[PDB]
A paper describes a structure:
Bestrophin-1 (Best1) and bestrophin-2 (Best2) are two members of the bestrophin family of calcium (Ca2+)-activated chloride (Cl−) channels with critical involvement in ocular physiology and direct pathological relevance. The overall architecture of hBest1 and hBest2 resembles the pentameric assembly previously shown by KpBest, cBest1 and bBest2, and retains the two landmark permeation constrictions, the neck and aperture, in the ion conducting pathway. Ample electrophysiological evidence indicates that the neck and aperture serve as dual Ca2+-dependent channel “gates”, as disrupting either of them partially impairs Ca2+-dependence while disrupting both makes the channel completely Ca2+-independent.
To further investigate the structural significance of the AS, we generated hBest11–345 and bBest21–345, and solved their structures in the presence of 5 mM Ca2+ at 2.4 Å and 1.9 Å, respectively. Remarkably, both structures exhibited 100% of particles with a fully open neck, in sharp contrast to the only ~10% particles with partially or fully open neck in WT hBest1 and hBest2, respectively. Previously, we found that bBest21–406 conducts similar Cl− currents to those from the full-length bBest212, suggesting an insignificant role of the residues after position 406 in channel gating. Remarkably, removing the AS from hBest1 and hBest2 results in truncation mutants that both exhibit a fully open neck in 100% of Ca2+-bound particles in cryo-EM and conduct indistinguishable and significantly elevated currents in patch clamp, while swapping the AS between hBest1 and hBest2 results in chimeric mutants with exchanged channel activities.
Residue numbers in the entry:
A (entry chain A), B (entry chain E), C (entry chain D), D (entry chain C), E (entry chain B): 2 to 339
Write the structure that this text describes.
């Protein structure tokens, strides 16, 4: 994620012009290789037309250029591309919203799972750790960065999200499906035990705990589903062919023709098709942004900060349910009591 | 479902070009027959114009070609097609979201329905099995693949989702409507019995069980409704006529005319209307993708994996509520306890 | 409702071509009268130009035709029509979702309202019947078909949804507003009585019953609101004028002009403006589909099956809460118990 | 609100043509003054060109007309207008959905607040009246019609929504912010008292009451927020300038030029720019509909019926919680009992 | 926020014309500097062409102008800009909806946390103050205006939202992440203590308190996430380049050419490209509105009134839970009791 929210708090004369200077997370870094390839192909074709082709070959080439310029608009680039990008962006925000955050659970846990003693601390920390473990399991399933951090379950154990006995039980479960849901079931069982022992003092609190657990587990399931049900491959293929087919056609149709031939709208050889380069910038960059966003859990500059979220959630959950449990300042009259 | 999420985790120079090489779930496999039919019809008309028609017939045909090319744009293909595809895709994701998954129920069941003995195991497994049975019934109602797997209720019994006595009661119910809802009522009754016998220890847990049951049953009902209330037939007919009428017109309007006749924008006979073939690819392929997505529970390559989901849900539910019930590792201090 | 979901489970070579053969619920049945009127008006004007008009009148008419063809595009048909159809379709699906279905209530009722005796059966059946009665009242308020089935409250009594004493109380209530909400209040009172007598064993179950009642009542209220707050009349008038004004203009602008006059793009008299007929088909058919969908509770072929839903809900609710109350097969080990 | 839902239950040959005859709530009534002003300005300019201008002035004017007709399309009317109208309509439906209806509260109140005696009736009626009072306060804050009905709090007292002692307490509260939320806090306090005295028999019912109160209060808050956070002024200004600037340009660019001058596409003087009048009708009428909808709580014909809703809610709430409290017909076997 | 909802309650002849006179929050104030820069650059280029360039240089410049006018349309300004503005506006309303308002919490607190004595008042005021403190912390994190009001936590203490002992505990917590969530955990702990001491009389009320706390905390978290996950930088850069590149091209392509040269559509030198100025107004103003809205928590005229909301919430919460706790007018018969 490349945040710039603070820099655009106010409308100002410069606008986003200062943002145009950023490299990390920028369109330029995404697209300069493709832009250079388009420009190089165009210049090679132009040089061939200017220096290699005989006069008769030049006349036929001019006919081909006029034809391609005339009929490249038959390719409905904006239609398919607008649809595709809208779908990708909608999925992008929904996937961020499905991130397995444990803040609501930590609030319920600190409010409902009681005891200053070692056993109460163990209950609170372990419930929070099961939630964090489910998050880690699903994220190493769907995020390339998290998987690199945790290539094996042994790495999960070494980071402290899972104990060795927990690891043994996890591997002993006979199931060929992804086991990210296992710590949520452990959470439900541990909550039942806490209720049975009276650490959870009432049925309503136990119910709230199970409700928030199911909300969390559903976020993990949504991440699983977004990972499994990709944007339909047909759409990705079609949009890709649309952009590439159009610019392949433009490599010919946008050639600068010999002004002495007197073709309509061809009396100026600027030698750099700067409007065509701008059009490639916009359409191919739109597609390139969709490419970055389609899997927001990779290692693009602006992909989601999944490892950061894992670390933050573990740290904040442990703080909230262990250090801050039943640790309040004195009930005092506020400044505006009178 | 043809997943490729992992392959597009990062924006890369190639883009989706590597995805262009996929066959299963690809646009090519969906559309090559129609594309070949368009090309063959076009070439037959071109050959007739080139070899069969007399000169006067050729002049009249050229007039017709110019006319059709001029006025085919009157057909608003992008308008109707954009609307139709947007509707279909929205329905597609909502239908996936309505898949009858039992994970939330299994969490509540393992947390609230107690007893290590045979009776407690029976309660937990049977509640989960009733949920899975409702899923199977609705899916064999709406999914062609699931119906092929379970052509009769006898097949449901043989797979273990329903007992023979349960089958007898199911058939004895006098109702002409789809009975997918029956196991959800069985679930409610069994939960009431569990509460009465004390297996469900509190009213809040019983309430949570009924809430999650109703959420699940509503997902099944949504699948029923999406199956019953198709995309309006008027829309499907109109969009189909739009695409076919436009390309039927293009079969004439996009013919290559004799360059010696000197018609404007007709001084080049490439003999293959490659831009028209690309346009058919895009518009007819858009329609073909809508055709794949409109019923996502069929046997297209990228239709939903309904049998896989049935098997996964049964396996995971049974594991969670039977093997993992009240089976926790020792409460131990974590790595960062200190 | 004209369902065809099963026929389009798989993408196939034919596509929706087989659907083009359907009459009931088809675009043809909606639009053939208007299409024939457009064609007849066009042919009358063409015949007048061809046979009645003098040469000078013909020249002036040709000028008028060129002018109308030139400037009919000033009318923004696709703009207003796209907006209008999007609004109508969104409302269409939301109205279907607001249908007063009693399945969730029947689940809660069978799970929480107890007694095999006559009194318990009366409680369960009467709660379900009050819900069904509220549905019937709102549907006869908003659906023309349901109102034809139940023109008076006496017809409601004769169908069994309301008793004679209930009818007397219903008429004795002094209120000029629609009384569809009355049986929901009766439901709340009857539930309170069931709780007081112990038929509802716990406060949580009573709360769940009231929650589901309020969900149901809100669906009925949403139907009332969609019926009362029509699509703004301004929009319907404007879109109607847009389509009609454009095709009125096309009746002149799309006339086939005498080819001997040599007007640009007018050297071919096909005598049937088939592209204009196709354009009327698409735009006027889009408007005609909006006309069908704007009130989905009428008697169009593809309007919602409101009487079917009323009958199904009553039958299924009675079955679920009376015949299937506390009527379970023996708790038995499943096939995969071991 | 101008309802016509019943008249369009079925698709019919006439379509919406019969709706074109309506005046109240019609586009004509909204737009005839502006349309007449456009037509008058156009005719004045035409008369000046036809009768006042010298020949040389006429030639320069013809140049200006051609220029304006050529370049008025630079103004992106459909772009900004489509966006603006979409935003306004979305807000319109959301604002209707936020109307402070008390039906859900009345159901909960009649089901949970008990006693046939005077005190129980007082509790039920006063809880409902507090909800209705909050509705009245917010509506007189946001609806011009309601404010005209209740220009002062004294008018609220005289209508019976607030007692004199309640008025004294309401004015004694020291707060410069809108006090619409005050009766909701009174509601919470009165519910707490009812629970303490046993009129609310259980904690679950008290919780449900507070939940529904918070839902209602949130609807009132949403109305407050929609009133405070207008559609951004920048958008309204920009869209207004777009429509006006375009038609100001059309006043010149759409002038009928002297046919003897032989300008291309100017050989016909119809003297009434009927296509331009139609275009003003559509674009300016779209803007005019947005003007009606942007504040749906005013006194436009099709604005929401806020006074009607206030009266209906008070009448229905009082009926439901006072006359119909614990007033049920005998539990009797229904027609299909056997 | 610049509200004008009251001024547009009714559709009127003037329309939004009176709104065109507003300066604060207007498009003019946002855009006059950029508009003046465009106009100045255009006039400098025009003066150079008119007075500095030699005849041959003038002919080449005319060729360049024709070329740029021809090909600037290749830049898809409306495509990218429409997408970008739609995304920004959606985020804008969602961010307003995530504002940390404490009204629902104050209702629950006044209804569930009891005692007229000093301790009960302390409980109610402190729970509300913790909620308000979390709001202040997140808002000083995301709003430039709030941060200016509270540059340090010491300023938070001095305003009364946090006590000195609370400040000491807040700083003693060892965490590098934003601590806005800390007072919500304090809230949960204080609620647990209130329940333990009997100030919260029942488990259901305690559950409702925790539910509303989690709703509030989630609003704060949503503000954090919208601040962190900006609109993707790629989109902002691309849209900015689109608008600037197009108008840079227009600086040349829209030059008034010498009418004696006889170029098509160039026989009129108005010397002020008023249609191009209008087009810059619309497109660049659309972008400028997106610039204002992208961070709605800054100090633009129409940014959200965050300091106002902080003050209002504190005042109203304190009033509701302290002055109005259990302070009701006598239960009296209403006007329509009979
Ligand atoms: C576009 C056609 C003419 C329109 C006429 C109106 C002008 C529209 C806005 C752009 C004006 C330049 C603003 C600028 O630049 O001044 C802003 C500000 C001043 O300085 P500061 O101290 O506030 O920082 O900030 C800076 O100058 C920061 C430096 C950032 C410069 C980045 C250059 C971008 C290249 C153009 C992109 C498009 C290429 C086709
Ligand atoms: C388009 C007009 C010119 C634009 C100029 C900029 C170039 C834009 C992106 C395309 C460049 C080719 C990339 C490529 O191809 O190299 C990527 C990579 C290298 O190799 P790797 O080892 O990373 O794998 O991956 C591969 O080459 C994998 C092989 C996949 C090749 C599939 C061929 C598709 C045919 C074109 C589709 C459009 C038809 C009209
Ligand atoms: C369109 C321009 C040329 C494109 C070239 C590619 C072809 C695109 C798809 C259409 C091909 C005909 C398929 C067909 O028709 O064969 C499918 C199938 C075979 O037979 P089956 O045993 O599978 O059944 O099903 C049937 O033939 C069922 C009979 C249904 C026929 C309905 C006729 C519709 C009239 C055209 C609509 C547009 C008018 C402008
Ligand atoms: C210019 C085209 C539209 C003009 C106006 C309508 C022309 C078609 C008249 C068809 C009347 C159907 C006869 C009938 O009343 O009986 C419908 C019967 C049962 O209905 P069902 O099959 O839904 O069950 O089914 C059938 O006879 C099959 C229904 C036949 C519909 C297919 C023909 C539509 C014409 C255009 C074809 C596509 C290119 C535009
Ligand atoms: C448009 C180009 C030609 C298209 C050819 C196809 C016709 C499309 C639909 C319109 C036909 C007239 C229907 C009509 O009018 O007959 C319907 C019906 C018959 O009578 P009924 O007893 O069912 O009632 O209802 C009435 O006639 C009620 C009277 C309402 C008349 C309102 C006149 C509107 C003026 C035109 C608007 C556009 C201006 C540019
Ligand atoms: C160029 C067209 C617009 C120019 C400006 C408005 C022209 C129409 C004036 C109609 C005034 C209605 C008289 C009235 O004040 O009394 C409305 C009365 C009750 O209203 P209600 O019927 O809703 O109940 O009803 C009626 O007299 C029936 C209402 C008549 C409205 C239909 C005529 C609209 C003109 C265009 C027709 C369509 C093509 C553009
Ligand atoms: C547009 C092409 C011709 C269309 C012909 C139809 C007219 C469309 C609506 C505009 C007419 C002027 C209304 C007006 O102005 O009268 C309204 C009203 C009268 O006075 P009142 O006592 O109700 O206040 O309110 C005022 O006059 C308040 C004064 C506000 C004046 C602001 C001037 C804006 C400049 C034009 C914007 C576009 C520039 C390209
Ligand atoms: Ca990525
Ligand atoms: Ca399919
Ligand atoms: Ca209908
Ligand atoms: Ca209004
Ligand atoms: Ca801002
Ligand atoms: Cl609850």
């Amino acid at each position: 994620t490349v945040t710039y929210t603070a820099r655009v708090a106010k409308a100002r004369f410069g606008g986003f012009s200062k943002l145009l200077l950023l490299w990390r997370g920028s369109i330029y870094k995404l697209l300069w290789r493709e832009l250079l390839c388009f420009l190089g192909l165009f210049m090679a074709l132009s040089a061939a037309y200017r220096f290699v082709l005989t006069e008769e070959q030049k006349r036929y080439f001019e006919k081909l250029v006029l034809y391609c310029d005339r009929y490249a608009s038959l390719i409905p680039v904006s239609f398919v591309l607008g649809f595709y990008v809208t779908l990708v962006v909608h999925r992008w925000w929904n996937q961020y919203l499905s991130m397995p955050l444990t803040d609501a659970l930590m609030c319920v846990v600190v409010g409902t799972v009681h005891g200053h003693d070692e056993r109460g601390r163990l209950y609170r920390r372990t419930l929070m750790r099961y939630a964090g473990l489910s998050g880690v399991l699903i994220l190493r399933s769907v995020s390339t960065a998290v998987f690199k951090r945790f290539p094996t379950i042994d790495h999960v154990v070494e980071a402290g999200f899972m104990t060795r006995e927990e690891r043994k039980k996890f591997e002993n479960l006979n199931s060929s499906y992804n086991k990210y849901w296992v710590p949520c079931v452990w959470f439900c069982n541990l909550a039942a035990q806490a209720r049975r022992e009276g650490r959870i003092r009432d049925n309503g609190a136990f119910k709230l705990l199970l409700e928030e657990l199911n909300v969390f587990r559903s976020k993990c399931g949504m991440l699983f589903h977004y990972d499994w049900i990709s944007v339909p491959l047909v759409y990705t293929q079609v949009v890709t062919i649309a952009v590439y087919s159009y610019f392949l056609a433009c490599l010919i149709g946008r050639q600068f023709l010999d002004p002495a031939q007197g073709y309509k709208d061809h009396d100026l050889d600027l030698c750099v098709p700067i409007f065509t380069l701008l059009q490639f910038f916009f359409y191919a960059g739109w597609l390139k942004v969709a490419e970055q966003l389609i899997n927001p859990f990779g290692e693009d500059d602006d992909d989601f900060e999944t490892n950061f979220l894992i670390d933050r959630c573990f740290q904040v959950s442990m703080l909230a349910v262990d250090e801050m449990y039943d640790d309040l300042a004195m009930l005092e009259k506020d400044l505006y009591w009178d």
